[PDB]
Amino acid sequence: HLNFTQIKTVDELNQALVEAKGKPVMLDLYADWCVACKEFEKYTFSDPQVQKALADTVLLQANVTANDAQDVALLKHLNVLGLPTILFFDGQGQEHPQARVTGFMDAETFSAHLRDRQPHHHH
Template sequence: FAGSGAAPATDQHTEDAFVTVSRPEDLQRELDAAKARGQWVMLDYYADWCVSCKVMEKQVFARSDVQAGLAGVHLLRLDVTADTPASQALLQRYQVPGPPSIIWVGPEGDERRARRITGEVDAAAFLQHWTQTRSQG
C-alpha cells in the first residue's frame, strides 16, 4: 500500500481546495488577502495541455497526506492554459518559464525563491520540499 500511490481523496476534493486565478489583478487580490491573514500561499502554475500538471494533480495534490500537509495554506492555481496577455503577465510576475511550477509565498507576502519547484515531482518529494520550506520560515 505505501508505494502504491493510492489515495482516498478524489479529484473533486483537489479542485475544491484550489482557487483558480487567470488574471494578474485576481492574483494580487488573493495574495493581499493571504498576507492580511498571515497565511502561506502556494502558487501552482497549471495548464490543461500540460501533461505533468495533470500527473501532479492526480498523483500528488489528490492524495490525502498531501492535502493534510497543506492544511492552512492558501492554494492558488494559476491557469495559463490560453496564451493571452493575462496568462503571460502571470508567468512574468515570477519569471516562470511555464508549467508545472510551484511558487511559495510566505505569510509576510515574500516569495521563497530558493524553494521553487519546477517540473514534475512525486508526492514524497513534494511533501519533503514543503516541510523544509515551512520550517525555514
C-alpha cells in the same frame, strides 16, 4: 482534488496575497495540455499526505491553458519559464525562489519539499 482559488491576472494575485496575509500561500501554474500538471493531479495532489500537509496553506491556481495576454503577463511578472511551476509565498507575502517546483514531484518528495519551507506557524 485540492480546493484552489483561481486567479487570472497579476492584480488578482496581488489581491489574493493581501487577503492571505498571515498565512502561507502556494500558487500552482496549470495548463490542460501540460502532462506534468496532470501527473501532479493524478499522483501527488491526490495523496492524503499532501492534502493534509497543505490544509493550512492558502492554495491559488492560475490556469494558463490559453496562453492569453493576461496569462502571458502573469507568467512574465513571475519570471516563470515553463510549466509545471509551483511558487510558495510565506505568511508575509514574500515569495521564496528556492522553493519553486519546476518539474513533477511524487507525493513523498513533494511532502518533504513542503516540510522544508520557511516556518509558518504563529504563536
